[PDB]
Amino acid sequence: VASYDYLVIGGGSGGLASARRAAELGARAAVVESHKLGGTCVNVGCVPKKVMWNTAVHSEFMHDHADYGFPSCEGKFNWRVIKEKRDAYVSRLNAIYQNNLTKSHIEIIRGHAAFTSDPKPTIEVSGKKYTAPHILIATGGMPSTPHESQIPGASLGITSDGFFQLEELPGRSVIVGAGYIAVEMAGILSALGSKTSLMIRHDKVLRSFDSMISTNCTEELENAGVEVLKFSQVKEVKKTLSGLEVSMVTAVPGRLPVMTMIPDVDCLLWAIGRVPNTKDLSLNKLGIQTDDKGHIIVDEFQNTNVKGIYAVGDVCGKALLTPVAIAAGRKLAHRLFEYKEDSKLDYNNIPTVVFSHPPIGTVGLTEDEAIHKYGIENVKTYSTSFTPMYHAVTKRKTKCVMKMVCANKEEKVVGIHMQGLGCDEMLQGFAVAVKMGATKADFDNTVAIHPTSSEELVTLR
Amino acid sequence: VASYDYLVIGGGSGGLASARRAAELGARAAVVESHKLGGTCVNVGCVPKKVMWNTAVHSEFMHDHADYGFPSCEGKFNWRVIKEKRDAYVSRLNAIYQNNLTKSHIEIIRGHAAFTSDPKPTIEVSGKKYTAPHILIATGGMPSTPHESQIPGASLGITSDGFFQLEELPGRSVIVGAGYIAVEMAGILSALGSKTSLMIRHDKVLRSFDSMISTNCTEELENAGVEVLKFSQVKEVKKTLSGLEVSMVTAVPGRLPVMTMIPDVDCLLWAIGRVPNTKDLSLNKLGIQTDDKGHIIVDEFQNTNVKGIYAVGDVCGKALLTPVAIAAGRKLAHRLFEYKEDSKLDYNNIPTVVFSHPPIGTVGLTEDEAIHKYGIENVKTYSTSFTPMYHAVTKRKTKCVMKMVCANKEEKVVGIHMQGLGCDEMLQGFAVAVKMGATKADFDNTVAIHPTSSEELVTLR
Numbered sequence A, B: 001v002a003s004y005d006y007l008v009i010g011g012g013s014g015g016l017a018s019a020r021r022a023a024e025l026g027a028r029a030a031v032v033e034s035h036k037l038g039g040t041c042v043n044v045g046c047v048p049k050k051v052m053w054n055t056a057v058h059s060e061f062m063h064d065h066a067d068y069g070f071p072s073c074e075g076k077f078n079w080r081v082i083k084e085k086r087d088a089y090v091s092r093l094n095a096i097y098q099n100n101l102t103k104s105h106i107e108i109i110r111g112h113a114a115f116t117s118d119p120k121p122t123i124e125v126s127g128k129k130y131t132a133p134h135i136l137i138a139t140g141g142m143p144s145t146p147h148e149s150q151i152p153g154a155s156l157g158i159t160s161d162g163f164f165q166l167e168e169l170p171g172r173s174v175i176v177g178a179g180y181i182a183v184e185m186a187g188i189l190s191a192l193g194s195k196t197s198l199m200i201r202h203d204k205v206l207r208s209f210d211s212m213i214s215t216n217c218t219e220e221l222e223n224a225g226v227e228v229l230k231f232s233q234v235k236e237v238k239k240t241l242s243g244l245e246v247s248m249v250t251a252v253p254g255r256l257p258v259m260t261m262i263p264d265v266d267c268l269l270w271a272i273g274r275v276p277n278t279k280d281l282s283l284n285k286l287g288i289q290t291d292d293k294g295h296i297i298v299d300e301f302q303n304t305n306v307k308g309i310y311a312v313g314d315v316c317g318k319a320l321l322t323p324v325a326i327a328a329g330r331k332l333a334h335r336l337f338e339y340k341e342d343s344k345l346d347y348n349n350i351p352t353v354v355f356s357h358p359p360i361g362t363v364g365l366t367e368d369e370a371i372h373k374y375g376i377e378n379v380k381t382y383s384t385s386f387t388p389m390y391h392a393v394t395k396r397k398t399k400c401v402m403k404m405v406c407a408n409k410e411e412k413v414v415g416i417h418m419q420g421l422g423c424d425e426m427l428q429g430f431a432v433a434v435k436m437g438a439t440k441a442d443f444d445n446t447v448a449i450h451p452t453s454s455e456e457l458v459t460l461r
């Protein structure tokens, strides 16, 4: 039984970040990883997604070429070219992460970890035992798929993982789900030329975002050529002579349900949720608490219910983002190895960018959330809607919408929501301002940068 | 003699902003404008410049098309197409500004104003007299050109004004100056296909910016195909059979001076400075103080040396930006018509974006300035340099450099300097944070947005 100061199960964002900081602090750490280092973000998430987004962005910009004084650009996007380049780049990152671990003197234990029956918390990987007084579970999650029992033929569809395996651009694609991943995938496939449908159970996407954003985002998708199938769900999927045939039920409220067949589908992409990876951990041997989806339950300090066992990142099921897993993993290392007992991540005011077209940036409370927290009488919002100057000379148009949610007399900024060209890079510093507790006067007292989109947020009235 | 509450001379950024706010406050105002409303920013500055920048940005992005999986885009940029569209857009803005004035009930007096000999400050426009207890001079500036006495043939060159009159893309262009305008023009002309040279008196451009930025900016220009002629200046210009011939002296220190002829020049663009527009105002009839360049001298509240006479914007020669003129003009209206005596613009921490390729964003003190303000022992900087993820798959490359200047033990953020893709939209919120007095912990405690360039500023170590 090899003993370490810190054993981290999972070599993705949270697990690596935590292991690296711990090692800086003098800890003797080891990371168990059964697949590729970098985990979801590098292999099948953040990185490959962004590359595909940059590609889709090229496609749109190329539509404006002639408007800008150039000759029309004519053609066909070649999926395999970019796919090969994207894979290579992921390969480069995996090699860097491995090197980062080595330079830090962190041991990499390759294989699938599981807890043992042993009294003092101990794991087994490939027959060998490993123990530490602090063990971090950072095993992440996976895409959720429907059971054949509920939706026959569901296994004919792919997930976001399968999306990163595709080698040709699917001619006809149907995406099921209304969350950010669904939105992102629909936007990429459509911009690159796939005849794309997005099938959502209600009338808008991103229903948990501020309502200005869910409305605007739904319209932008339609305007970009994505067919949004509202109040619809899949009833069955079948393999026809040439592709898939999707049977769906559309049930608009105030109307009779109607069943429709969608034929000749090349790609059926389930983007319905993520499930935690805890199933094969043998958690029950230690009696570690999970919720009914399999998420590990933790407190504000990432503690599980068992002493010396922690969990961070996707596996915990809250704020499923690369930077949160990293920040939580880091704060945890400072708490354990630097003896900073108050060291923990604040889960409020975490900013998010959704890589739609145009991108979305959000931080803090939606208007409804502020209304429930402070009361209608105490909430004031400011908003603007305009066409960015980039489109002054284009036939194709996109809008920029921004909304500021203020609370109390002081007009504290408690929420910022926007969608528009450049909003992906614009959000970070306002997130800093929001975290510091800025009020509207603080924004108003900052001299604008002209001509930009960003200047609209400091000149709202 | 028609009397008003407020008479504003100049209908550009500062003059309009001040007049509009004053009118909201109940003032009976009139704006004197001898040319087009909107003044420099709309007609020959900010707006038309940005449109030309967006165009140049299209040209660069089109170089990456094939790398992104598309077929090579082949050609020739058509200057007149975009020029016509740009003019139209400026026409649209002029009509809006005029309407804004009318809706506000501000009187527009068309013509050239000059002060009179009269005791109580009074102006004359087209034979008629006008007076007010508060008169704002906001007459802006103009491009500076060399005297034929010092540089013979200088009048064969054009200025940034003339740039906006061009109808064809000049084949060979030489830009003289090393400030932001020179840099911007060089970058646009070059990206659009002009064989461009930038002639600077020293070895770097933007010598007043933080030294990381002047160095990086000079390299980016060279990398983009702009020939930077260092330690050079124009000695004479002459009209040859086919274009202009520029005689220049290059005097590298530690070397003998060398004279060179630059032949076949289509466009010689002077971007050497701006001069205030005060010459024809008859300021001396009121004894209003100017410096030796013709700038009107004012105090912290925009007061001139004469009671009831103020000046804002370019004419004052400090912080020559559209938003500063606006903010100063607004604060002034609140002071005069809302009786807010402490109402004035803080000229510290004004953010600037330079529309180079990639763009530059700066706010606060350069490293040297912080060193002079706090002492070397009290200044700590953090910086990063990386290749944005956008170029992971391109043969063409650009860099992103960021620098954070902190002061004292607390590591107050006193300067942010960066150059890179997306830095034009990234700066605004960090400018808010800097204005609020953020420290490095405030940045560090803000969760990053992945994957973006902006996230680098919150993860500096």
Ligand SMILES: Cc1cc2nc3c(=O)[nH]c(=O)nc-3n(C[C@H](O)[C@H](O)[C@H](O)COP(=O)(O)OP(=O)(O)OC[C@H]3O[C@@H](n4cnc5c(N)ncnc54)[C@H](O)[C@@H]3O)c2cc1C
Residues within 6 Å of the ligand: A009, A010, A011, A012, A013, A014, A015, A032, A033, A034, A035, A036, A037, A038, A039, A040, A041, A044, A045, A046, A049, A111, A112, A113, A114, A138, A139, A140, A141, A160, A181, A277, A280, A281, A312, A313, A314, A315, A319, A320, A321, A322, A323, A325, B450, B451
């Ligand atoms: C398509 C997609 C796009 C996304 N886009 C973004 C985005 O743009 N921005 C953003 O912030 N977030 C994004 N996310 C979310 C972000 O990628 C995740 O929140 C983050 O990767 C979670 O990190 P983690 O450390 O919890 O787990 P992960 O990186 O999944 O790492 C878990 C690791 O544990 C390994 N493992 C699991 N069980 C075991 C075991 N028993 N033994 C050994 N090893 C094990 C797994 O192989 C894996 O390598 C995206 C996610 C997806 C799916």
Ligand SMILES: Cc1cc2nc3c(=O)[nH]c(=O)nc-3n(C[C@H](O)[C@H](O)[C@H](O)COP(=O)(O)OP(=O)(O)OC[C@H]3O[C@@H](n4cnc5c(N)ncnc54)[C@H](O)[C@@H]3O)c2cc1C
Residues within 6 Å of the ligand: A450, A451, B009, B010, B011, B012, B013, B014, B015, B032, B033, B034, B035, B036, B037, B038, B039, B040, B041, B044, B045, B046, B049, B111, B112, B113, B114, B138, B139, B140, B141, B160, B181, B277, B280, B281, B312, B313, B314, B315, B319, B320, B321, B322, B323, B325
């Ligand atoms: C090429 C270029 C690019 C620029 N790019 C940017 C940028 O991207 N961002 C930015 O922030 N700034 C930029 N600037 C600077 C910005 O445009 C100026 O700081 C701003 O326009 C100054 O406004 P102002 O109100 O002082 O004067 P102006 O807008 O020049 O207005 C002065 C007005 O007074 C009128 N006038 C003058 N004398 C008289 C008189 N006697 N009687 C009646 N009317 C009179 C003039 O016709 C004019 O309309 C740029 C400038 C230039 C030249």
